[PDB]
């Protein structure tokens, strides 16, 4: 009937970043480990193994909507993630991804809302990670004879 479905070249891969223990780094490492991708350090000779560099990330929390009294009703956080796949000998390829989420505010339970803001952000860090790995197929096909 209809056929059933990470490339073989990226079954072994390097993960490098200035903040290796950060939320984004651990999220990406966990997610790609779920896909069966083996992780090795750069201490190996490593000429055929591709690299996945995490350039940076930032969260921007702005007011999405406002009530009739001029107070925030719901915030919308946007996580921008910058990465780049490094294929040795075939130049680097940058990747960017966004995660848009939103939640209603409530100053009467501010602490609670903080616990929600920490819960969403974490989830976003995971979601972004997914959106980084699904774009690797688009980076593999970018390698064409020019």
């Amino acid at each position: 009937g209809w056929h059933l479905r990470v490339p073989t070249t990226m079954k072994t891969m390097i993960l490098q970043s200035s903040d290796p223990n950060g939320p984004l780094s651990r999220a990406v490492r966990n997610q790609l480990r779920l896909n069966g991708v083996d992780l090795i350090d750069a201490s190996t000779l490593r000429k055929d193994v591709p690299s996945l560099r995490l350039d940076g990330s930032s969260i921007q929390k702005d007011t999405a909507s406002v009530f009739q009294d001029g107070r925030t009703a719901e915030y919308q956080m946007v996580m921008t993630v910058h990465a780049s796949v490094l294929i040795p000998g075939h130049d680097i390829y940058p990747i960017t991804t966004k995660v848009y989420r939103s939640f209603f505010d409530n100053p009467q339970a501010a602490l609670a809302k903080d616990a929600e803001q920490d819960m969403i952000i974490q989830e976003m860090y995971d979601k972004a990670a997914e959106q980084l790995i699904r774009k690797l197929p688009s980076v593999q096909v970018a390698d064409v004879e020019a």
Binding site: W2, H3, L4, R5, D19, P20, N21, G22, R26, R33, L34, G36, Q60, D62, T63, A64, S65, V66, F67, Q68, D69, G70, R71, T72, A73, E74, Q76, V78, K98, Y100, R101, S102, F103, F104, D105, N106, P107, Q108, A109, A110, L111, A112, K113, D114, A115, E116, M119, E123, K127, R134, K135, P137, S138, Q140, V141, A142
Partner: protein, 552 residues
């Protein structure tokens, strides 16, 4: 003193309704290559004085940080509105800090304190505006490395309301986490927390909560499917105090020592079916099923400190928590089912996405303190539905949306949609729309559904636009409109022109600021303001109370 600097900055002028004419004359001081300061006299007309806005920035091995202190010795209008105390000084203090020392130590600070709740309503700045309902005061220091992390923090909040400023605070809060991935076929995950909750109101109860949560997870996957099981325990203990008065005021059965242990069983299966289309395009269809079981526990003797109802995104349907925090863990006997459909072009770029999901309840989700006034008493069945979508027709246009529906409300709970046309930084137009039903506000926010400011919910359209008319001139504007009241919430129009090296920038903004009592029911207060500022950057897009965010 102040020398070895760059010099005076070019001043800027403003005319607003609450401050009158305003003249800011900044003065920059480059103390060192890694830290500097900025002193800004900011003269205000009808305020009757000069607010001194002080900024300082530093870059150290412990972290990068910024500190702000705005100070006005006396305010005339505020003295007219609040003439009880002769002291009329108004000020703001802000401190941001962030640093990762040796890739393990994490130092963070986000502190905001103001003199009165009506500060950000009158004085706008980068660190607050009229839309803020409370100021945050968080400190955090932790140690993080791969398999283990432990962070200690203190969280406080200054609520901007003279009648009801009751808000809890964690002083302090300890979060510990252990990980180990290859325990046979199981990935383990231990989580522990120790928190001490205190309130500004002494009549509210204090508590010391201890939480222990081990989580074992067995993930299996092949070529087409992925089945992941999970067992999680939730042990919690509460040492509460100061309960007699609160138990007298409200009909509650809070006790000093409360224990609660809950199991949790979750199973999550996922599949994927690829399907090839015309011209080398390739779509895919992924179904996902998840079963969740959590026994019921009577949590009526436990207080509420950091638990609030969550919103169900499409992925949020598969979440194993109804509330935040650890005070209200609802019972579960749920079956979530969902389906996603993506497409790709010849270059395998993800262009279009649709997600539709639902959850079916076998038994009702109880906590022991379920006083959420729903519109109807539907306890079981396919109650909650959700959906998301994203469309990219080319490199310029874009689209994204999402809607969450609930049968207990008999109306769509949440609904946002946004389309955007994005050439570059200077040329773009965006049209968005956000919606929240009165039933949603009534269910999630019991206190706001009574007042006329928040009763009818939200139905707000928005139009942002940055466009240059003449080849060298540039114009930008924004317009937000409320559908229920047929009134505008925020309007903006501004022009900018780079003559040679430094550009001139004129702007205008009108916004909802407050709510006017004593009327024929009630009306909204509006504030107008014009501004003149005299490198090539467009801060006008993010200068409104509803800043512009690119949706691609």
């Amino acid at each position: 003193g102040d020398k070895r600097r760059s010099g005076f900055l070019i001043p800027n002028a403003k005319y607003s309704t609450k401050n009158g004419v305003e003249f800011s004359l900044p003065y920059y001081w480059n103390i060192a290559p890694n830290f500097d300061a900025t002193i800004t006299p900011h003269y205000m007309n009808k305020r009757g004085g000069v607010m001194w806005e002080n900024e300082f920035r530093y870059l150290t091995q412990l972290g990068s940080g910024l500190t702000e202190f705005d100070y006005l010795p006396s305010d005339k209008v505020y003295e007219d509105d609040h003439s009880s105390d002769s002291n009329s000084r108004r000020w703001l203090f802000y401190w941001n800090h962030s640093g990762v020392i040796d890739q393990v130590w994490r130092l963070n600070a986000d502190y905001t304190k103001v003199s009165d709740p009506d500060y950000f309503n009158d004085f706008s700045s980068k660190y607050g505006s009229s839309t803020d309902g409370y100021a945050t005061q968080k400190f955090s220091a932790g140690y993080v490395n791969q398999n283990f992390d432990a962070t200690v923090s203190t969280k406080q909040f200054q609520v901007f309301d003279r009648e009801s400023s009751n808000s809890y605070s964690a002083e302090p809060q300890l979060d510990v986490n252990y990980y180990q991935n290859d325990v046979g076929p199981f990935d383990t995950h231990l989580y522990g927390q120790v928190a001490h909750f205190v309130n500004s109101n002494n009549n509210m109860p204090e508590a010391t909560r201890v939480h222990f949560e081990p989580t074992i997870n067995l993930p299996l996957s092949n070529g087409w499917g992925s089945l992941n099981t999970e067992a999680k325990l939730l042990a919690t203990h509460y040492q509460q105090s100061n309960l007699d008065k609160y138990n007298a005021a409200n009909g509650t059965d809070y006790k000093e020592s409360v224990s609660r242990v809950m199991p949790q069983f979750k199973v999550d299966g996922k599949m994927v079916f690829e399907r090839d289309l015309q011209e080398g395009f390739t779509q895919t269809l992924e179904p996902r099923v998840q079963y969740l079981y959590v026994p019921y526990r009577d949590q009526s003797e436990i207080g509420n400190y950091d638990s609030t109802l969550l919103q169900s995104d499409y992925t949020g349907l598969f979440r194993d928590r109804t509330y935040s925090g650890l005070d209200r863990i609802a019972s579960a006997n749920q079956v979530t089912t969902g389906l996603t459909s993506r497409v790709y072009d010849a270059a395998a770029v993800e262009r279009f996405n649709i997600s539709v999901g639902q959850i079916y309840y076998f038994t009702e989700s109880r906590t022991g303190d379920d006083n959420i006034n729903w519109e109807n008493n539907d306890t079981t069945g396919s109650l909650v539905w959700a959906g998301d979508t994203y469309w990219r027709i080319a490199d310029e246009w874009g689209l994204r949306g999402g809607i969450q529906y609930d049968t207990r409300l008999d109306n769509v709970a949440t609904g946002n949609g946004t389309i955007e046309y994005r050439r570059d930084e200077n040329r773009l137009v965006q049209l968005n729309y956000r919606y929240a039903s009165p039933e949603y506000i009534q269910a999630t926010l019991p206190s706001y559904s009574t007042a006329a400011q928040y009763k009818q919910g939200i139905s707000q359209v928005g139009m942002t636009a940055s466009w240059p008319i003449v080849d060298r001139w540039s114009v930008v504007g924004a317009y937000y409109y409320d559908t229920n009241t047929r009134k505008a919430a925020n309007q903006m129009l501004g022009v900018q022109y780079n003559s040679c090296c430094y550009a001139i920038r004129l702007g205008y903004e009108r916004k909802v600021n407050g709510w006017n009592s004593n009327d024929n029911g009630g009306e909204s207060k509006y504030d107008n303001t014009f501004g003149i500022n005299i490198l090539g950057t467009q801060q006008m897009l993010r200068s409104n109370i509803l800043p512009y965010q690119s949706s691609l």
